């Protein structure tokens, strides 16, 4: 309607106040709204990358996004002086500090990883806080610990830069799929952190899964890694079964309850309501006693060292420091009792933080900045991929290969634009490398930049003029090898079709790359790639026999959440529409046998399991009984309570 008439193009000139998420998308002017919405969702679906790189083609609004998002870095807002450092573990310690200006006392804790939810989290770069010792000084702006997304100069990058080409690789790119080289797969690796809790009571005992005959360890130490994908296993102890089951405590038995997780331990916390003396007696829980004494000694240290600070009347302590001191003092205090879910628990409860590096796998989704979703179809050797063997760029290989069929139909031209600009940037860098004069190099660079974005050209002129000759040489060399930054702001300052036309007509030498064994000359160029959360491990499920509901029908269990099982074991539902589609086969008897043996009837299920367990493995023929199904029994009872009874005519 005419309401949109209020929108005046002159009012929003040189303005980006209407853009929000789209600010991270270069050439947002050219992308369609659907792909932009997909990008906004992808930014949430993104995962932290171990080898995060600043974008080659950027909007310069990215570092602002990184700064104002507070979950990745920690900044000591005031000037501080390190009062003390106390170690809980080698991976986790605590720093007590004091504001030099205000005089208040505050606290800063470190850890190797931070967990967000489920199996999602990230590793930390704790080198700045680890360099700090007692009586050192923290400035007003200092990154005590940072994520891998931020580099040394606080530049923020949510993904990697990968050399891409639009190619049809043996029809492995049908619809939208990506084939990626192993070297590029290394750059697309992420972190996986899990907080798994194993609860032990007086009935159950741990098993010597880790160690030898002299050393009894039921769980890995802090530095150790997980073996056989089992954090621990527990056996219920009863005097009747103790004579035979307790012997060979080192090996697993069918009665044991195992707990599955994979990675490296980084923090273990044990809460024990058992008397410490009884643990001293028990050999199987000796490691638990050792870690309990470690936590108690750390709390004793913090009490002894911060009593003067907390209990000094003419002193100010932050609420965080006060709560920390109070919790540690409660833990060292006598008659302390721990409750889980508002219930006093028997035995103890152990919480493990486990960190691993998970790489790129088939079925994992990686996308660009323009809604170009893709599923990794094949991870191939980097040699068995398009290689160019003509010209100066010989030996260059494509890191990823994308589907070229419907690039125009997806209404996302910015993908092609970024690829083209990085492709011509390759030629600019090569021309710079061939020249032997630094002035010639900066002249070529300023020419290309002025052709793309003029403001970046002015800023680079200022930056180069300010640099020392050695610093300028380092700048030039790293630009030649690593790549040149090009700025394509989302809405104003982007490079359009006519600007690219001018660029292509000026640089007459630039032409399509001729690759080995490929008739069509194609273009390879760096584009930005981010990794999405959806993965083959996310929704994988495999159930044969699992826990049955109270009604005798299969149902899901919380075992996968509690890390008691490796895969989901979640039952699929056969919908009513699925029944209709299956009814195409007029063998309703076979469909009813399927549903009865798999779910409705217990006798048919037991018969099926027995036939598959004993008999001929290669030829399986089953005979099923005609006993009424449990679903029919429940129906009969419900209708009986209604006062109606279905009877066959």
């Amino acid at each position: 309607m005419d309401d949109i008439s209020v929108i005046k193009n002159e009012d929003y000139e040189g303005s980006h106040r209407f853009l929000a998420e789209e600010l991270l998308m270069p050439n947002a002017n050219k992308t369609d709204g659907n792909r932009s919405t997909m990008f906004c969702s992808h930014l949430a679906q993104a995962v932290t990358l171990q080898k995060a790189e600043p974008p080659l083609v950027y909007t310069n609004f990215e570092n602002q996004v990184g700064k104002y998002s507070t979950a990745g870095y920690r900044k000591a807002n005031s000037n501080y002086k390190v009062i003390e450092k106390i170690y809980k573990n080698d991976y986790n310690y605590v720093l007590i500090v004091q504001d030099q200006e205000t005089g208040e006392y505050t606290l800063f804790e470190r850890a190797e990883c931070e967990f967000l939810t489920e199996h999602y989290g990230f590793q930390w770069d704790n080198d700045k806080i680890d360099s700090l010792k007692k009586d050192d000084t923290i400035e007003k702006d200092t990154v005590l610990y940072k994520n891998t997304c931020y580099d040394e100069n606080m530049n923020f990058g949510y993904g990697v830069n990968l050399n891409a080409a639009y190619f049809s690789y043996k029809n492995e790119t049908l619809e939208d799929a990506i084939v990626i080289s192993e070297s590029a797969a290394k750059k697309l690796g992420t972190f996986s952190v899990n907080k798994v809790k194993v609860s032990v009571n007086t009935n159950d005992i741990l098993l010597n899964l880790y160690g030898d005959n002299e050393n009894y360890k039921g769980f890995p130490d802090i530095g150790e890694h997980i073996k056989n994908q089992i954090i621990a296993s527990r056996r219920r102890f009863d005097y009747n079964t103790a004579l035979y089951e307790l012997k060979n405590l080192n090996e697993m038995r069918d009665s044991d309850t195992p707990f599955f997780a994979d990675g490296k331990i980084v923090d273990i916390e044990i809460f024990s309501n058992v008397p410490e003396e009884e643990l001293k007696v028990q050999k199987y829980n000796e490691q638990v006693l050792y870690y309990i004494n470690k936590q108690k000694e750390f709390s004793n240290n913090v009490y002894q060292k911060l009593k003067k600070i907390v209990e000094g009347k003419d002193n100010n302590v932050s609420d965080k420091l006060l709560h920390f001191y109070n919790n540690c003092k409660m833990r060292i205090d006598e008659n302390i009792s721990y409750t889980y879910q508002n219930s006093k628990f028997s035995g103890f409860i152990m919480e493990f933080t486990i960190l691993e590096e998970e790489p790129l796998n088939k079925g994992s989704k990686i996308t660009g900045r323009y809604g170009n979703k893709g599923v990794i179809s094949k991870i191939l050797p980097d040699d068995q991929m398009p290689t160019v063997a003509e010209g100066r760029f010989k030996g260059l290989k494509a890191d990823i290969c994308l589907n070229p069929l419907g690039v125009f139909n997806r209404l996302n031209p910015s993908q092609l634009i970024e690829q083209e600009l990085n492709w011509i940037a390759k030629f600019i860098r090569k021309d710079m490398e061939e020249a032997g004069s630094n002035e010639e190099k900066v002249s070529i660079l300023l020419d290309f930049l002025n052709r793309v974005n003029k403001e970046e050209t002015e800023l680079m002129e200022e930056f180069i003029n300010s640099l020392n000759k050695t610093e300028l040489e380092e700048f030039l060399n790293d630009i030649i090898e690593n790549g040149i930054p090009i700025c394509q702001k989302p809405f104003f300052g982007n490079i359009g079709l006519d600007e690219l036309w001018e660029l292509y007509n000026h640089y007459d030498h630039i032409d399509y790359f001729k690759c080995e064994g490929i008739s069509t000359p194609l273009i390879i160029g760096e584009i930005y790639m981010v990794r999405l959360k959806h993965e083959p491990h996310s929704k994988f499920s495999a159930r044969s026999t699992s826990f049955m509901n109270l009604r005798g029908l299969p149902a899901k269990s919380k075992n996968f959440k509690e890390h008691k099982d490796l895969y989901s074991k979640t039952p699929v539902r056969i919908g009513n529409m699925e029944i209709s589609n299956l009814s195409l086969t007029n063998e309703m008897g076979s469909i009813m046998d399927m549903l009865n043996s798999y779910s409705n009837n217990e006798t048919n299920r037991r018969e099926l399991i027995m036939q598959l367990l004993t008999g001929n493995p290669f030829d399986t023929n089953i005979d099923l009984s005609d006993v009424e199904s449990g679903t029919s029994k429940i129906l009969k009872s419900l209708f009986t309570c209604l006062g109606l009874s279905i009877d066959d005519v």
């Binding site: 639009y166 049809s168 043996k170 029809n171 070229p404 069929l405 092609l416 490929i518 008739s519 069509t520």
Partner: protein, 48 residues
């Protein structure tokens, strides 16, 4: 290409809708798809 389907249809009518001729149609589809993949990787396709 549009006529290919017709051929297949006539095939189904020529051999009396035999199960074997249906198996052969599926085999032809698989082989033609493999050769299509070969043509696509050797003769590249690109948008720019």
């Amino acid at each position: 290409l549009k006529e290919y389907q017709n051929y297949y249809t006539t095939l189904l009518e020529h051999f009396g809708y035999s199960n074997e001729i249906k198996s052969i149609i599926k085999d032809v589809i698989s082989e033609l798809a493999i050769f299509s993949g070969d043509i696509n990787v050797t003769f590249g396709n690109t948008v720019s």
